[PDB]
């Protein structure tokens, strides 16, 4: 009923503002596409684009803008109802997962309590260019959901309801009367501030609330104490500013900028918390250690640290001890924030080191001192209030709020080192074999003599690499995470960084993690890791700890979806074995995206689908682009997301899934090869593919959304091979074909059952009994439920060259064949059977996505072929009667009047309907 | 049910921190006291007095603190159960009042609309010394109420409830382990910020919300229009920093600090609002006027205003016009709050006049442009959103937030004018008769030649009068309200200030209002007013607008409750008629306050009790000290308080109470005389009364609470005549005798029914029909129901000398005869027979108030009588075993150790139990 509420209110506003005609048109468009949805009639689609094409440039944008906002309001009305259904329950949460591990799994609470203390989940916010949404519009969503949630409260006045309704009205109209298009790419610093706003508005306050829940959950299974505040049960990191992989606009200056901005934000968040705490901690009873400190600070009036906040210092009573300690802490915090602002504006501050907080230890000392004071006075109840929450923030967020991960292409380090060994007349590091590089790199690392000559000639690219290590060397180590190597292949790559890092003067080096992103590299991966582990120098370096990252984006782009997901499984599984053998604690970093074809899917299931005994309280997962909004857009969402990662990781540690029987293994090994062959037979071993690709899907238009700062093609020259993973998945998502997601799965299924009809009962046994296999298929079913090959055929009809058109039909035949087999194996007769609501959800959502699909296909044609002329209709908006101000929102467009805006809106809208950008 | 939740939790905490024996002791006191309550056995009181007197210094406090906290928790639970019951009675107010005035009164919705546009209710915040509570404790009340409110919600989980409970637990214990006693007198600037916290935290956001309800209520009677945003339907003024009467600590400099501090606070609130509004108004459609200005500001990079927020200007995209204007509006606001800071912190500022906002019209210029733009583009729905709420704040709060009322004694201006006539050798102004004073003042006022010599000899008082005017001369006129003359008697006082104001160079002078505080002045009052009109000079000055204040505090002190209340009635009545005849809009400023003995009572009833046709949408009322927390302590409270004032005043204008029958009037005049004489025969015409007074009540110990900056006596000489109304009322309120509240009412009733038995059928006939008479008798009834003459008798025992003792017993015979005569006229057999819930609350509260009544009397004894012997008990607190850090919280008490802090806690406690300080 919620979407009938929002769609009906939008339409009244559409009519009120533009005239009934246009409102009828948007409504007629619904039913023409609903006749396609209902019966399957393909003739409908042609008739619909007949209408859309002739529209005025102002009306065209209007129609496209309108379908966007209705499709968006359909999403908000679903989120609200999802939230309502979850709440009305009174997959699993944290308190249930404890009670289960104690009851059913037969574990002791002290084992569960122990397991907890050792657990640490690290969610890494990144700025992967998958968020078309202007923040301005996002904020409006939160209010719309909020007006909608309250509106449907149980107890409420007629007046309160009548006024919340008015509030909902104007909020919708505000969103509609804003330009939904970003008119210039963000800077990396913008990207960072954008993502920090989640840390501010939901994560900051929402961490101690989840933790106190974990306290309550611990008490319900008998544990009589709270989770010790130095436990980092959950942490947060960022790539916003650090990941420069294929993004030259992330310069050494940008990294320094972000690092300091973070410290600023942090200090300012703490200042606010400390200040509320000073109003609360009014109590006079303190223990001895604190009294002494409080009496030093009282007499010295702050120990002369600020002279700002000096008004406060004189008039503070003596018998308010806690207020004096915190008063000092807050004076110090202001300095820390101000020293950052000066270091950002000038690079040097007048404000000294020990007039501010430099280390996390320095900051914790007075805080814990307050805690122990309050405990020693018997007021541990008082202590476990806002004070406890703060302490947990300090261990969870620290002084720079979020740690920064640095990531650079593998081959870029090679170019530096080769420039070095060339200048120095030692030969070409690029030309050496891998074993020689290791031997050379290892001599240097052991050696006591400098290598990098200052007079080294440098390309701009060699400059950026060294200049990055330079910025790393001057910034506090507690602001960084690890250094990640994109395209990491062999132990050379890791050692090459360890060296460059040392030879650029990084006094305390960042731990080096490789990112195995491709199929070959994930196979050779445990072999890579064992070589490193076996080196005496490297082993002393890492000290029992090694982190390694696995990319789900570029994996599935190399092999198929099936082969990549399997290779990712056993590459985790084997590395954990090598690490266990060498006594190294492996910590897996998961490069998961939002879409299914990049490791997307429910959080608790994604964990459950990972090899047993390869987590054990230590895991890092990326949260990419729009996924931050999905997970941390609202207070409850943030809390719920912390719940999933924590409860899953816990269970998975103590009660791991079933290891795959050898039957299952061999069959996955065999299918994956067939699947890879079939996938690569389409994307790699086929000349005319790239021409069909850039023709049938809106691939080449993705940059026009101005989403992120990254040029999303690694190099103009060239081909599909350099096209980033995100616009890839995006291209096939708009068209609703989802090619890279299912290609190869059908062949692997067909191979297995044709090889031996017995295997049908083996596939069935795996889908029932093996979490990994089940989750993978289930996720594929969801995709196919969001799939319509009839739409893919519609792009093929209007845009694809004639010779290739049968190639397209050949592909759609595989789509249907794959779906067909998938269902049989799963034991489903119908698609999205065994799942209500998400099928219901696709019923109202679809006719609009169909309308946009049609709109976009024709809008693409109109752009590409000047010859496709269509007879222009009369204007529909009462606003744009006679000679158009809205179209002028796009100053200089490469395309004819209103064609680029119509296109962008079709992309944004279809992405909203799919609830995914790419 | 709600109090049982809280009181029990405190006890568990009390037992948890100090051991079982103490907990049982506090419980023993209850039932001992309860035994007195349910039977009336005066022996139990003395019994308890034994126990409480022997206690250790640490335990004497802990007990008083514990009764206080429980007494407060009982108040808290009652506030939450009142709010609950109110919301249930919406599943009168303003939407009902509009409907009733249309259907029942037969007014047109247009007439109703119009009378609202012409209404204005000015609520005056004052710092009258009646808030014992430290603000750090009050904040904790709020959290307790909240935690208690969420605890008893309909939808709530088991764990949510478990944690809300844990949050309630620690919040009580926090308040308990805080020193409740303010250890130092506030400054007037401390007092002012204290009051402004209410403006910030509830009144700021709460005004626009209330007006939006008035919108909806207008639409429910079919108006189809919003109450135009320029209507100030409700306004807020302040005395905090302006009221000088009897407080030499309110210097000219205090007034200057308060005036700037406010403008700082105001800009700082407008900045936070504007910043949100910029986020919101992201629309691109604007009208021509806005577009022009928008491009001027955009292309000039801000129009050169601040250089702060310069990072924002470069950021600003072109087609976001609203953010552009608003951005400049913000820049200009930053300057305004800084300029105040520099004007406060030192003589002047670098920041110019026209780099900031100087006039309210200059601030409204760009905002209204935005509003008209959005309406012009058809987005008025958006315009009525957050923008509308701000605009209404601009009209309601202006650039200074609240207007400062200056108030000074009548004779203090006389002193100045006598120093001038003596210095210039014109004569002695003081010795001149009233008609001569008027004649001379008017010569000077008509004259163009200066008067005040700069070489004038001044005492310190005279330098505080002239120096104050000098401050008003400098500060912008829109920061002040009127100049209020306390002890106003004749038209000379008003003309005297009009002259001093001009002769001190106050360029645009404050309008002069006289405060008629006493009986003789309220009688001459309408004649004074007519005299002040009919003067052709004074008529041109006021220009049809005259305000006069009536004092409810100092009236009852002069004449007695009934005789005051009645003279106050016809004071307003006749002044109205004079004003009406002269074509003058009389605005009445009512000086009320908390206690019933100072014009206290329910807001809508007080306004009902006021004479017909003496309001007409123009009124001001004092919200004194602790009453501010009573009205504006919570969001819901603030809304409810604007509701009563707006609905009562509107209704009273268009649907007046009845005029009294001539029979009633004559009886009131006759009874007034009788009541006055009876009341004065006790407090004036009895030599030994003043000795009895400072003996049977803790009147003299008032100053030890450190409530206000104002010394509670207007200097030692005078006796009772100089003791301010507040510590006066407080004294009888502690002892639960309430002497000034009911003394004379018995004698007035007895006289009336004895003069003619027919009058009994009149006195009832009045109570049933007359709003004035009924409200006064009911408010009396509430007092008596909070009254216990058995307690007054317990103070008389332990404290009053043996000769004065029967005098005390004579008064107690008047108490009973009065309460008896009251109930016979009210048609009640029992006391609070018509009020079931207010009577219930006094059932659980009373035994704690009784326990503190006993504790106080004996504690007063130990101070005054060092020959009083009592045998000490063993320590009850496990915290204080052997020889006490708590009693050392008093630096150097004039009384024996722990006797002052115990005496104070018994006053604050009893104060909470009566829900009134004084």
Query: What single string gives the DSSP state of each residue in A379-425?
Result: -HHHHTTHHHHHHHHHHHH-SSSSEEEEEEEHHHHHHHHHHHHHHTT
Report CB contact under 8 Å: A384, B170. Answer: yes
According to the 3-state scheme, what is the secondary structure of A164-203?
HHHHHHHHHHHHHCECCCCCCCCCHHHHHHHHHHHHHHHH
For residues B521 and B545, state if they share a domain. Answer: yes
Measured distance CA(A535)–CA(B192) in Å, rounded: 72
The alpha carbon dihedral of B74, B75, B77, B82 has a sign of positive
Name which of A153, A157, A214, A884 to mutate to probe chain B: the one with the most chain B Cβ atoms within 10 A of its Cβ: A157
Measured distance CA(B209)–CA(B214) in Å, rounded: 9
Q: Which of A895, A892, A853, A910 is nearest to A57 (CA)?
A: A895
| Torsion-angle region of A827 (φ positive above 0: left; ψ -120 to 50: alpha; else: beta) | left
Residue A456 is given by DSSP the state -
Measured distance CA(A675)–CA(A562) in Å, rounded: 7
The helix/strand/coil state of A620 is strand
**Given the structure tokens 């939904």, which residue do they identify?**
A180
For residues B218 and B349, state if they share a domain. Answer: no
| Residue A268 φ/ψ, nearest 5 degrees | -70, -30
Measured distance CA(A630)–CA(A643) in Å, rounded: 14
B553 within 8 A of B591, measured Cβ to Cβ: yes
For residues B63 and B149, state if they share a domain. Answer: yes
Q: Which of A18, A44, A51, A128 is catalytic?
A: A128
| Torsion-angle region of B317 (φ positive above 0: left; ψ -120 to 50: alpha; else: beta) | beta
Does residue B479 belong to any structural domain of this protein? yes
Measured distance CA(B479)–CA(B143) in Å, rounded: 34
The helix/strand/coil state of B541 is helix
Estimate the share of chain B in helix, then strand, then coil, as percent rounded to the nearest 5: 65, 5, 30
CA B271 and chain centroid, separation: 29
Total beta-carbon pairs less than 8 A apart between chain A and chain B: 112
Alpha-carbon dihedral of residues A195, A197, A201, A205, nearest 10 degrees?
Answer: 70
Domain with B816, as residue range(s), is 1-86+133-181+662-706+716-914
Measured distance CA(A722)–CA(B193) in Å, rounded: 64
B54: CB partners within 8 A, 6+ apart: B870, B871, B872, B873
β-pairing verdict for A234-238 and B585-591:
unpaired
The helix/strand/coil state of A512 is strand
Q: Which of A409, A380, A596, A403 is nearest to A497 (CA)?
A: A409
Report CB contact under 8 Å: A282, B162. Answer: no
Does residue A319 belong to any structural domain of this protein? yes
Minimum-distance CB partner of B174 among A13, A177, A283: A283
CA distances from B91 to A159, B86, B520 (A): 11, 9, 51
A703 within 8 A of A809, measured Cβ to Cβ: no
Q: Tally Cβ neighbours within 10 Å of residue A510.
A: 20
A613 within 8 A of A582, measured Cβ to Cβ: no
β-pairing verdict for A618-624 and A120-126:
parallel
Measured distance CA(A667)–CA(A749) in Å, rounded: 10
Measured distance CA(A764)–CA(A787) in Å, rounded: 24
The helix/strand/coil state of A486 is strand
For residues B452 and B531, state if they share a domain. Answer: yes
Tokens of A132: 């078309």
CA distances from B553 to A827, B488, B519, B600, B733 (A): 86, 14, 12, 9, 15
Minimum-distance CB partner of B381 among A170, A284, A377: A170
Tokens of B385: 């959103």
A30: CB partners within 8 A, 6+ apart: A847, A848, A851
Minimum-distance CB partner of A136 among B174, B177, B279: B279
For residues A4-24, b (16+ Cβ closer than 10 Å) or e, as one string?
ebbbebbbebbbebbbeebbe
For residues A813 and A853, state if they share a domain. Answer: yes
Minimum-distance CB partner of B173 among A155, A170, A382: A382
| Torsion-angle region of B404 (φ positive above 0: left; ψ -120 to 50: alpha; else: beta) | beta
Does residue B564 belong to any structural domain of this protein? yes
Q: Tally Cβ neighbours within 10 Å of residue B652.
A: 24
Smallest Cα distance from A821 to chain B, Å? 44
Measured distance CA(A811)–CA(A742) in Å, rounded: 11
The helix/strand/coil state of B917 is coil
Q: Tally Cβ neighbours within 10 Å of residue B349.
A: 18
For residues A649 and A500, state if they share a domain. Answer: yes
Q: Which of A44, A51, A403, A557 is catalytic?
A: A557
Report CB contact under 8 Å: A163, B216. Answer: yes
For residues A742 and A818, state if they share a domain. Answer: yes
Report CB contact under 8 Å: A173, B87. Answer: no
Name which of A83, A136, A901 to mutate to probe chain B: the one with the most chain B Cβ atoms within 10 A of its Cβ: A136
Measured distance CA(A752)–CA(A671) in Å, rounded: 7
Q: In chain A, whose CA is at the least distance from the CA of B159?
A: A216
Residue B714 is given by DSSP the state S
Does residue B636 belong to any structural domain of this protein? yes
B474: CB partners within 8 A, 6+ apart: B256
Q: Which of B105, B112, B167 is nearest to B140 (CA)?
A: B167
Measured distance CA(A821)–CA(A833) in Å, rounded: 15
A810: CB partners within 8 A, 6+ apart: none
B798 within 8 A of B697, measured Cβ to Cβ: no
Examine residue A718 and say whether the peptide bond preceding it is cis (omega within 30 degrees of 0).
yes
B840 within 8 A of B77, measured Cβ to Cβ: no
| Residue B647 φ/ψ, nearest 5 degrees | -75, -40
β-pairing verdict for B234-238 and B512-516:
unpaired
Residue A102 is given by DSSP the state H
CA A291 and chain centroid, separation: 47
The alpha carbon dihedral of A600, A605, A607, A613 has a sign of negative
Contacts of A216 in chain B (CB under 8 A): 159, 162-163
Tokens of A342: 């000066």
Q: Which of A613, A594, A610, A590 is nearest to A602 (CA)?
A: A594
Smallest Cα distance from B413 to chain A, Å? 35
Q: Which of A653, A258, A203, A633 is nearest to A396 (CA)?
A: A203
Tokens of B354: 């026209």
For residues B74-110, b (16+ Cβ closer than 10 Å) or e, as one string?
bbbbbbbbebeeeeeeeeebbbebbbbbbeeeebebe
Q: Which of B520, B485, B917 is nearest to B728 (CA)?
A: B917
Q: Which of A708, A716, A715, A736 is nearest to A907 (CA)?
A: A736
Q: Determine whether A135 is exposed, middle or buried from the number of CB atoms within 10 Å of its CB (0-12, 13-18, 19+).
A: middle
- Whole-number CA gyration radius for chain A: 29
| Torsion-angle region of A574 (φ positive above 0: left; ψ -120 to 50: alpha; else: beta) | alpha
Tokens of A53: 């094409």
Q: Does B283 touch chain A (CB under 8 A)?
A: yes
Minimum-distance CB partner of A157 among B90, B137, B139: B90
Q: Determine whether A581 is exposed, middle or buried from the number of CB atoms within 10 Å of its CB (0-12, 13-18, 19+).
A: exposed
Measured distance CA(B473)–CA(B452) in Å, rounded: 15
The helix/strand/coil state of A828 is coil
Q: Does B382 touch chain A (CB under 8 A)?
A: yes
Does residue A670 belong to any structural domain of this protein? yes
Q: What is the resolution of this structure in A?
A: 3.3
Report CB contact under 8 Å: B170, A381. Answer: yes
Q: Which of B889, B780, B739, B726 is nearest to B132 (CA)?
A: B726
The alpha carbon dihedral of B810, B814, B817, B819 has a sign of negative
Q: Which of B328, B557, B738, B814 is catalytic?
A: B557
Q: In chain A, whose CA is at the least distance from the CA of B318?
A: A889
Q: In chain B, whose CA is at the least distance from the CA of A220?
A: B159
Cα angle value A168/A172/A174 (rounded, 5°): 115
β-pairing verdict for B512-516 and A512-516:
unpaired
The helix/strand/coil state of B554 is helix
Q: Does A20 touch chain B (CB under 8 A)?
A: no
Q: How many residues does chain A have?
A: 918
What are the residues facing A404 on neighbouring strands? Answer: A238, A480
Final residue belonging to a domain, choices B632, B656, B680: B656
Contacts of B384 in chain A (CB under 8 A): 166, 170
Smallest Cα distance from A264 to chain B, Å? 16
The helix/strand/coil state of B237 is strand
CA A579 and chain centroid, separation: 28
Q: Which of A729, A852, A832 is nearest to A785 (CA)?
A: A832
Q: Tally Cβ neighbours within 10 Å of residue A146.
A: 16
Tokens of A327: 């008063």
Cα angle value B603/B604/B606 (rounded, 5°): 65
B561 within 8 A of B745, measured Cβ to Cβ: yes
The separation between the first and the last C-alpha atoms of chain A, rounded to the nearest angstrom, is 30
**Given the structure tokens 């611990």, which residue do they identify?**
A218
The helix/strand/coil state of B671 is helix
Measured distance CA(A62)–CA(A52) in Å, rounded: 11
**Given the structure tokens 């299924």, which residue do they identify?**
A749
Smallest Cα distance from B12 to chain A, Å? 13
Q: Determine whether B902 is exposed, middle or buried from the number of CB atoms within 10 Å of its CB (0-12, 13-18, 19+).
A: buried
Smallest Cα distance from A571 to chain B, Å? 41
| Residue B407 φ/ψ, nearest 5 degrees | -135, 130
Final residue belonging to a domain, choices A400, A421, A449: A400
Number of domains in chain B: 3
For residues A673 and A795, state if they share a domain. Answer: yes
Give the residue ranges of DSSP H helices in B827-898: 836-864
Interaxial angle between packed helices B321-345 and B252-280, expressed in degrees from 0 to 180 and rounded to the nearest 10: 160
Report CB contact under 8 Å: B889, A284. Answer: yes
CA distances from B564 to B284, B569, B586, B599, B679 (A): 63, 9, 21, 10, 11
The helix/strand/coil state of B723 is strand
Tokens of A782: 């969801």
**Given the structure tokens 């109090």, which residue do they identify?**
B3
B524 within 8 A of B490, measured Cβ to Cβ: yes
Q: Does A90 touch chain B (CB under 8 A)?
A: yes
For residues B321 and B383, state if they share a domain. Answer: yes
Q: Which helix (H) or strand (E) holds B551?
A: strand B545-551
**Residues after which chain A has a gap (C–N > 2.5 Å):** 90, 883
Name the experiment that determined this structure. X-ray
A734 within 8 A of A697, measured Cβ to Cβ: yes
Q: Which of residues 166-185 of B touch A (CB under 8 A)?
A: 167, 169-171, 173-174, 177-179, 183-184
Estimate the share of chain A in helix, then strand, then coil, as percent rounded to the nearest 5: 65, 5, 30
Examine the residue annotation and report whether A128 is marked as an active-site residue of this protein: yes
For residues B859 and B725, state if they share a domain. Answer: yes
Interaxial angle between packed helices B789-799 and B689-696, expressed in degrees from 0 to 180 and rounded to the nearest 10: 100
Does residue A711 belong to any structural domain of this protein? no
Measured distance CA(B53)–CA(B386) in Å, rounded: 60
Minimum-distance CB partner of B163 among A154, A177, A216: A216
For residues A642 and A505, state if they share a domain. Answer: yes
For residues B175 and B127, state if they share a domain. Answer: no
Does residue B529 belong to any structural domain of this protein? yes
Tokens of B649: 């005043």
Q: Which helix (H) or strand (E) holds B622?
A: strand B619-624
Measured distance CA(B207)–CA(B269) in Å, rounded: 14
The helix/strand/coil state of B803 is coil
A520: CB partners within 8 A, 6+ apart: A489
B724 within 8 A of B714, measured Cβ to Cβ: yes
- Whole-number CA gyration radius for chain B: 29
Query: What single string gives the DSSP state of each residue in A739-799?
Result: HHHHTTHHHHHHHHHHH-GGGHHHHHHHHHH-HHHHHHHHHHHHHHHT--HHHHHHHHHHH
Q: Does B12 touch chain A (CB under 8 A)?
A: no
Tokens of A829: 């007769």
Alpha-carbon dihedral of residues A539, A541, A547, A553, nearest 10 degrees?
Answer: -100
**Given the structure tokens 């109205």, which residue do they identify?**
B576
Q: Which of B44, B128, B328, B604 is catalytic?
A: B128
A215: CB partners within 8 A, 6+ apart: A226, A227
Contacts of A382 in chain B (CB under 8 A): 170, 173-174, 177
Measured distance CA(B579)–CA(B530) in Å, rounded: 8
For residues B523-552, b (16+ Cβ closer than 10 Å) or e, as one string?
ebbbebbbbbbebeebbebbeeebbbbbbb
Name which of A179, A197, A275, A326 to mutate to probe chain B: the one with the most chain B Cβ atoms within 10 A of its Cβ: A179
What are the residues facing A260 on neighbouring strands? Answer: none
Q: In chain B, whose CA is at the least distance from the CA of A319?
A: B889
Report CB contact under 8 Å: B280, A174. Answer: yes
Report CB contact under 8 Å: A183, B280. Answer: no
Final residue belonging to a domain, choices B400, B430, B451: B400
Which residues in B233-302 belong to E strands, given as ranges?
234-238
Does residue A481 belong to any structural domain of this protein? yes
Q: Which helix (H) or strand (E) holds A589?
A: strand A585-591
Q: In chain A, whose CA is at the least distance from the CA of B215?
A: A163
Measured distance CA(B297)–CA(B370) in Å, rounded: 14
Measured distance CA(B36)–CA(B850) in Å, rounded: 9
Q: Does B157 touch chain A (CB under 8 A)?
A: yes
Alpha-carbon dihedral of residues B557, B563, B567, B569, nearest 10 degrees?
Answer: 110
Measured distance CA(B234)–CA(B97) in Å, rounded: 17
The helix/strand/coil state of A619 is strand
| CATH number for B333 | 1.20.1440.90
A766: CB partners within 8 A, 6+ apart: A664, A667, A773, A774
Q: How many residues does chain B have?
A: 918
Measured distance CA(A10)–CA(A16) in Å, rounded: 10
| Torsion-angle region of B901 (φ positive above 0: left; ψ -120 to 50: alpha; else: beta) | alpha
B631 within 8 A of B623, measured Cβ to Cβ: yes
Tokens of A547: 């982190």
B267 within 8 A of B337, measured Cβ to Cβ: yes
Examine the residue annotation and report whether B557 is marked as an active-site residue of this protein: yes
Alpha-carbon dihedral of residues A131, A137, A141, A143, nearest 10 degrees?
Answer: 140
């Amino acid at each position: 009923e919620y979407d009938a509420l929002l769609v009906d209110r939008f339409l009244n506003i559409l009519q009120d503002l533009h005239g009934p005609s246009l409102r009828e048109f948007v409504q007629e468009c619904y039913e023409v596409s609903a006749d396609y949805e209902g019966k399957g009639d393909t003739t409908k689609l042609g008739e619909l684009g007949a209408k859309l094409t002739g529209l005025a440039p102002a009306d065209a944008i209007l129609v496209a803008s309108s379908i966007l906002h209705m499709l968006n309001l359909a999403n908000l009305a679903e989120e609200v109802q999802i939230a309502h259904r979850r709440r009305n329950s009174k997959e699993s949460d944290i308190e249930e997962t404890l009670k289960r591990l104690v009851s059913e799994v037969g574990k002791s609470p002290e084992e569960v309590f122990e397991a907890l203390k050792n657990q640490t989940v690290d969610l890494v916010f990144t700025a992967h260019p998958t968020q078309s949404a202007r923040r301005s519009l996002l904020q409006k969503n939160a209010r719309i959901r909020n007006c909608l949630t309250q509106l449907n409260a149980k107890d409420i006045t007629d007046d309160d309801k009548q006024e919340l309704d008015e509030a909902l009205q104007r909020e919708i109209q505000a969103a509609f009367r804003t330009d939904e298009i970003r008119r210039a790419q963000p800077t990396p610093q913008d990207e960072m501030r954008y993502g920090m706003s989640y840390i501010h508005e939901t994560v900051w306050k929402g961490v101690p609330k989840f933790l106190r829940r974990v306290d309550t959950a611990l008490k319900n299974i008998g544990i009589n104490e709270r989770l010790p505040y130095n436990v980092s049960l959950i942490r947060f990191s960022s790539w916003m500013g650090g990941d420069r992989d294929g993004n030259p606009r992330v310069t050494p200056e940008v990294t320094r900028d972000v690092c300091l901005l973070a410290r600023m934000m942090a200090a300012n968040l703490y200042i606010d918390q400390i200040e509320e705490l000073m109003f609360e901690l009014s109590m006079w009873r303190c223990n001895d250690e604190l009294r002494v400190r409080a009496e030093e600070l009282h007499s010295s009036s702050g120990s002369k640290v600020t002279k700002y906040y000096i008004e406060f210092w004189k008039q503070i009573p003596p018998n308010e001890p806690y207020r004096v300690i915190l008063g000092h802490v807050r004076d110090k915090l202001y300095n820390t924030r101000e020293r950052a602002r000066h270091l950002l504006a000038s690079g040097v501050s007048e404000i000294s080191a020990e007039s501010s907080f430099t280390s996390i230890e320095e900051f914790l000392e007075p805080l814990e001192l307050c805690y122990k004071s309050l405990c020693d006075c018997g007021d541990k109840a008082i202590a476990d209030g806002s004070l406890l929450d703060l302490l947990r923030q300090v261990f969870t967020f620290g002084l720079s709020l979020v740690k920064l991960d640095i990531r650079q292409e593998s081959e870029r380090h090679t170019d530096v080192i080769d420039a070095i060994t060339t200048h120095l007349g030692i030969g070409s590091y690029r030309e050496w074999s891998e074993d020689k590089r290791q031997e050379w790199l290892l001599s240097e690392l052991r050696g006591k003599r400098p290598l990098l000559p200052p007079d080294l000639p440098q390309t701009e690219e060699i400059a950026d690499v060294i200049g990055a290590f330079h910025v790393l060397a001057e910034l506090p180590p507690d602001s960084f995470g690890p250094y990640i190597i994109s395209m990491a292949t062999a132990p050379s790559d890791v050692l090459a960084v360890e060296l460059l890092q040392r030879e650029c003067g990084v006094r305390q080096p960042l731990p080096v993690v490789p990112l195995f992103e491709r199929l070959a590299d994930l196979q050779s991966a445990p072999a890579s890791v064992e070589r490193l582990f076996s080196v005496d120098w490297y082993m002393d370096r890492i000290k029992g700890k090694q982190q390694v990252m696995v990319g789900y984006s570029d994996s599935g782009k190399d092999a198929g979806r099936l082969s990549a997901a399997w290779q990712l499984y056993r590459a985790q599984e084997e590395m954990a074995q090598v690490a266990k053998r060498y006594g190294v604690k492996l910590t897996l970093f998961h490069g998961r995206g939002g879409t299914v074809g990049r490791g997307g899917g429910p959080t608790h299931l994604a964990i459950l689908s990972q090899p047993p005994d390869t987590i054990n309280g230590s895991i890092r997962v990326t949260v990419q682009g729009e996924v931050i909004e999905f997970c941390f857009g609202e207070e409850h969402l943030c809390f719920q997301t912390l719940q999933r990662f924590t409860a899953a990781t816990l269970e998975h540690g103590m009660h791991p899934p079933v290891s795959p029987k050898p039957e299952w293994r061999k069959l996955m090994d065999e299918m994956a090869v067939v699947a890879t062959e079939e996938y690569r037979s389409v994307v790699v071993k086929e000349a005319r593919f790239v021409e069909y690709f850039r023709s049938a899907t809106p691939e080449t238009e993705y940059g026009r959304m101005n989403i992120g700062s990254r040029p999303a093609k690694r190099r103009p020259g060239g081909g599909i091979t350099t096209l980033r993973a995100i616009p890839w998945i995006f291209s096939w998502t708009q068209t609703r074909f989802h090619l890279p997601v299912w290609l190869g799965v059908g062949a692997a299924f067909k191979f297995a059952i044709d090889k031996d009809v017995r295997n049908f009962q083996v596939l069935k046994e795996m889908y029932n009994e093996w979490p990994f296999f089940r989750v993978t298929l289930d996720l594929l079913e969801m995709v196919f439920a969001k799939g319509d090959p009839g739409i893919a055929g519609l792009y093929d009809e209007l845009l694809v060259a004639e010779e290739l058109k049968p190639f397209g039909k050949q592909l759609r035949d595989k789509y249907v064949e794959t779906q067909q087999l998938l269902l049989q194996i799963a034991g489903h007769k119908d698609i999205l059977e065994g799942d209500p609501f998400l099928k219901q959800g696709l019923v109202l959502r679809n006719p609009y996505i169909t309308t946009l699909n049609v709109f976009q296909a024709y809008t693409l044609k109109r752009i590409r072929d000047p010859n496709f002329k269509v007879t222009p209709q009369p204007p529909l908006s009462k606003e744009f009667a006679d000679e158009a101000g809205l179209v002028k929102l796009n100053p200089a467009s490469e395309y004819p009047p209103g064609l680029e805006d119509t296109l962008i809106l079709t992309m944004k809208g279809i992405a909203a309907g799919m609830q995914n950008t790419g």
